[PDB]
């Protein structure tokens, strides 16, 4: 058995399924993690960050919403999330600031709704660093 | 009721209403089916269909047609019979057991005979 089979799927679209990958970089609660061919079976919670599937050829990088990641004993990593995001040609700085700024005003609104605003701030700030 | 008795009047009426409700939904049955019938309506149909089949009676004169010996039922037993069916004390017994049956006892008897015939 050479390589590791990746299974990156979503509740609306499936990207990778039993596909061999050289390396993957997905943010974890404990901290940023990496995986290669043979990797010790670890089960960590994925936080709203950025994942990058590596290949012998140029590797593509997509933004992830969050979920779980589990590396099966048989050398098989499984990534589960909600929504996905392409390189940068998909997101727009202008489209983000609009809501982003409105989030700070949600703290001003009733706390019941401001609770979700705090969670948005984080995700939004990370979107800016993706611009690179 | 001032002649056949109060109970006899009530039992009879209940039989009619039940049969009537089956007829009023007949149009629906041929089009959609019983799957579309409500829980309450679907229970009345089966019960109704049971009462209808139960109405049949083997005739001694027509034994040469049915091949089944005549069955003479008394008025006293007939009333109690349907009344017992209305109360829902025989909703477990299959409908076939009500077809061409004489006495209410013969229903449960015939229901048991059908258990041995099942393969």
């Amino acid at each position: 058995s050479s390589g590791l089979k990746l299974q990156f799927a979503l509740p609306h679209e499936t990207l990778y399924s039993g596909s061999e990958v050289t390396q993957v970089n997905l943010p974890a609660k404990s901290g940023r993690i990496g995986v290669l061919a043979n990797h010790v079976p670890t089960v960590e919670q994925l936080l709203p960050g950025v994942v990058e599937v590596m290949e012998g050829s140029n590797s593509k990088k997509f933004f992830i919403s969050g979920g779980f990641a589990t590396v099966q004993p048989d050398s098989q990593l499984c990534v589960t999330a909600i929504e996905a995001f392409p390189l940068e040609s998909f997101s727009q700085e202008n489209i983000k600031n609009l809501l982003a700024e409105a989030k700070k005003n949600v703290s001003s609104s009733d706390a019941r709704e401001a609770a979700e605003a705090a969670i948005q701030v984080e995700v939004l700030e990370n979107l800016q660093s993706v611009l690179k | 009721a001032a002649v056949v008795g109060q109970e006899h009047y009530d039992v009879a009426s209940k039989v009619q209403e039940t049969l009537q409700t089956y007829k009023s939904l007949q149009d629906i049955i041929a089009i959609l089916g019983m799957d579309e019938l409500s829980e309450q309506d679907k229970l009345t149909v089966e019960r109704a269909r049971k009462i209808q089949r139960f109405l049949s009676q083997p005739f001694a004169v027509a034994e040469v047609f049915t091949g089944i010996p005549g069955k003479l039922v008394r008025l006293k037993d007939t009333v109690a019979s349907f009344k017992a069916v209305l109360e829902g004390k025989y909703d477990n017994i299959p409908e076939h057991a009500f077809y061409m049956v004489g006495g209410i006892e013969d229903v449960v008897a015939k229901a048991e005979k059908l258990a041995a015939e099942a393969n």
Binding site: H12, A81, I82, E83, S91, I95, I119, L127 | -
Partner: protein, 59 residues
Amino acid sequence: SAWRKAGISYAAYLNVAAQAIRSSLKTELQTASVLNRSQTDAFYTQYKNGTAASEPTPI
């Protein structure tokens, strides 16, 4: 900014990020598939032991 303290379940924690992301992209590359994907009209109602119920509310 605690989410598991006074926020919501982990299902909702990733949910808010799913809509924020899907709404952080271009308006041109946003199919109707994503629009209704963030839309819902379901209301919940708590019932008692005696068929009773509470005032209806939005999910």
